[PDB]
């Protein structure tokens, strides 16, 4: 789950779960998912409270209740929010006063659910870089921040401490759209390349959020649709897709020293 997916979950909670007292709570007895507190203490703490707002930074979601502490969700690889089982994969479950039920599931057990006095003042949220959607860097700030990073551009975009919210599919998408190879060193990007990337990040994220992360609604010219196909059967806009991370060799070339080291 990347920024769009988590944002869609946040909006869904905001539209259907606010101002409703929590009548029942079921926190899975999962030592791997439930972090920093016991399930029983977690259940006791939030019972009877109301959700005031749903917040998000990067791929992290948290619920502001009428009194702290607040529950936070680090999705992991298979985390998801459902609003109506109680699924055997539910980790966080609450029944509201109007009968509506809210659940965070994780079949893989890689998610992290916490209960914090102030989610934003402690890790992992406190260590996150600016949100790609809510706090975008300016064109010049972006170029300046890239100038001294001797890191290949894709992994840098995946560094939540640099910019938060981008995952593998968005990374592949913005680099493909900006015509930048994923192995190009950040500090080697020209001012023009930096701006092209600044633009693609804005456009891809806004479009994805515009359609509530419904990938079936992503533009057809997006590499997203075929970035998970077997080698030799992956094409976008008629051009061959290669894998290292999906990219299009004909449209994404390596430049300078990086190209030299590659060859």
């Amino acid at each position: 789950p990347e920024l769009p997916e988590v944002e869609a979950a946040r909006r869904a909670i905001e539209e259907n779960c606010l101002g409703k007292k929590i009548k029942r709570v079921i926190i899975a007895d999962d030592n791997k998912v439930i972090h920093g507190i016991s399930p029983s203490d977690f259940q006791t703490s939030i019972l009877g409270k109301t959700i005031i707002s749903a917040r998000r930074k990067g791929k992290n979601l948290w619920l502001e209740l009428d009194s702290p502490p607040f529950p936070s969700f680090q999705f992991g690889m298979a985390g998801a929010i459902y609003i109506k089982w109680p699924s055997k994969y539910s980790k966080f479950f609450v029944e509201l006063d109007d009968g509506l039920e809210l659940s965070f599931t994780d079949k893989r057990r890689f998610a992290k659910v916490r209960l914090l006095a102030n989610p934003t003042s402690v890790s992992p949220i406190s260590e996150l870089g600016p949100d790609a959607l809510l706090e975008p860097m300016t064109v010049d700030e972006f170029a300046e921040s890239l100038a001294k990073k001797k890191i290949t551009i894709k992994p840098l975009l995946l560094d939540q401490g640099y910019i938060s919210g981008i995952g593998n599919w968005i990374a592949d998408e913005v680099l493909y759209q900006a015509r930048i190879h994923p192995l190009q060193t950040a500090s080697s990007l020209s001012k023009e390349q930096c701006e092209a990337l600044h633009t693609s990040i804005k456009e891809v994220i806004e479009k994805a959020v515009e359609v509530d992360a419904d990938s079936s609604q992503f533009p057809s010219n997006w590499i997203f649709h075929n970035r998970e196909k077997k080698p030799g059967k992956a094409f976008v806009d008629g051009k061959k897709i290669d894998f290292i991370t999906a990219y299009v060799p004909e449209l994404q070339k390596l430049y300078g020293k990086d190209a030299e080291k590659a060859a």
Side-chain angles (χ1 to χ4, degrees), residues 95-138:
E95 188 193 327
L96 309 182
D97 61 12
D98 66 345
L100 189 144
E101 300 180 305
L102 168 62
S103 175
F104 172 75
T105 60
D106 174 27
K107 201 239 179 70
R108 299 297 301 295
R109 303 184 75 181
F110 292 161
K112 294 292 179 54
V113 183
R114 302 177 173 83
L115 185 56
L116 310 168
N118 188 324
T120 67
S121 69
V122 297
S123 64
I125 300 171
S126 64
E127 310 186 311
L128 295 177
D131 191 76
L133 173 70
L134 299 175
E135 319 167 73
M137 307 178 161
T138 59

Side-chain angles (χ1 to χ4, degrees), residues 152-159 168 171-172 175 182 184 227 245-246:
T152 46
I153 193 63
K154 176 169 178 180
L156 178 64
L157 294 176
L158 297 177
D159 181 347
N168 274 290
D172 287 0
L175 293 171
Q184 192 69 236
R227 62 178 296 285
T245 298

Side-chain angles (χ1 to χ4, degrees), residues 142 146 153-154 156-157 162-163 166 170-180 186 189-204:
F142 190 52
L146 291 170
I153 193 63
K154 176 169 178 180
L156 178 64
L157 294 176
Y162 172 55
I163 291 178
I166 303 175
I170 291 176
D172 287 0
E173 199 65 58
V174 304
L175 293 171
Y176 168 62
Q177 298 305 316
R179 307 312 191 222
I180 297 168
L189 296 169
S190 66
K191 282 286 186 171
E192 292 91 340
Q193 291 181 299
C194 286
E195 196 181 314
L197 180 55
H198 175 84
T199 295
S200 64
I201 289 174
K202 180 180 185 304
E203 308 190 324
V204 171

Side-chain angles (χ1 to χ4, degrees), residues 214-234:
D214 179 342
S215 68
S216 73
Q217 277 180 279
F218 289 173
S220 63
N221 70 316
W222 277 22
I223 193 170
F224 176 87
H225 301 106
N226 293 306
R227 62 178 296 285
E228 302 208 299
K229 299 304 175 186
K230 282 189 178 299
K233 302 192 303 177

